[PDB]
Amino acid sequence: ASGSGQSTRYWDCCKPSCSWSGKAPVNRPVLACDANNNPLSDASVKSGCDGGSAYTCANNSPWAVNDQLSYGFAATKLSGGTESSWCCACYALTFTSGPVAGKTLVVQSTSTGGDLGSNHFDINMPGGGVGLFDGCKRQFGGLPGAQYGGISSRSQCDSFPAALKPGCQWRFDWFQNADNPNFTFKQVQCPSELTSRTGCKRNDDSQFPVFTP
Numbered sequence: 001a002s003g004s005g006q007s008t009r010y011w012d013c014c015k016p017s018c019s020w021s022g023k024a025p026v027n028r029p030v031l032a033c034d035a036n037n038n039p040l041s042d043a044s045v046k047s048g049c050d051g052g053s054a055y056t057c058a059n060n061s062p063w064a065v066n067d068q069l070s071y072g073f074a075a076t077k078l079s080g081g082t083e084s085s086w087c088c089a090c091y092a093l094t095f096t097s098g099p100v101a102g103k104t105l106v107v108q109s110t111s112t113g114g115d116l117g118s119n120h121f122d123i124n125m126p127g128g129g130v131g132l133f134d135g136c137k138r139q140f141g142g143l144p145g146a147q148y149g150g151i152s153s154r155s156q157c158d159s160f161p162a163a164l165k166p167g168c169q170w171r172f173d174w175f176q177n178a179d180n181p182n183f184t185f186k187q188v189q190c191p192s193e194l195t196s197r198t199g200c201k202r203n204d205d206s207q208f209p210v211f212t213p
């Protein structure tokens with residue numbers, strides 16, 4: 001898949017939808033975590049957003065490699081696709097608007113986003129907003145910030161759980177607090193940096209081009 005799309009930001013702490021078995025042709029589904037960021041090899045644990053105890057791992061956070069390139073994660077809803085075609089796929093995003101215009105973010109899809117424009121990427125970042133399901137309230141008592149869009153000042157990251165602070169600050173640092181920047185995207189082979197965090201690699205990963213930083 002390739003094309004253009006709109007971005008939002010989120011972190012709801014819920015078990016990612018690609019953490020369920022049988023969703024896509026993969027070696028294994030995305031690792032969810034317990035409330036203390038220990039990975040759950042058992043894909044049957046119920047989502048903390050449904051009264052269970054499985055949450056998004058803190059390592060599903062974005063980070064910068066250099067001033068031009070970051071790696072991270074997103075919830076995707078793509079024209080012509082299904083969960084079976086995007087779960088655990090990677091995509092190189094090139095931003096086309098906002099202060100980050102021209103920068104590159106390579107993401108792995110770990111969940112399904114909502115319909116928003118032609119190709120929505122809901123980009124993971126702690127403190128970007130829980131939205132509809134406040135899993136973080138159950139995981140550790142909640143994150144600060146607006147329901148949609150999350151926190152508004154960088155200092156609000158200071159009270160986050162330790163493992164969520166780097167991703168929280170990335171939003172204000174490399175990402176320049178960009179507000180829903182647009183992008184073009186291309187599906188690519190997943191960098192090992194991403195699959196080593198989620199443990200999930202698509203059987204069709206090699207059908208797509210290698211990403212070159």
Ligand SMILES: OC[C@H]1O[C@@H](O[C@H]2[C@H](O)[C@@H](O)[C@H](O)O[C@@H]2CO)[C@H](O)[C@@H](O)[C@@H]1O
Pocket residue numbers: 007008009010011012114122128129130131132147148149150180
């Ligand atoms: O609904 C998708 C996504 O929205 C996020 O909030 C958006 C909001 O919908 C939009 O109106 C505003 O302009 O920007 C914010 C931040 O992107 C919300 O944080 C997510 O939880 C939600 O999944």
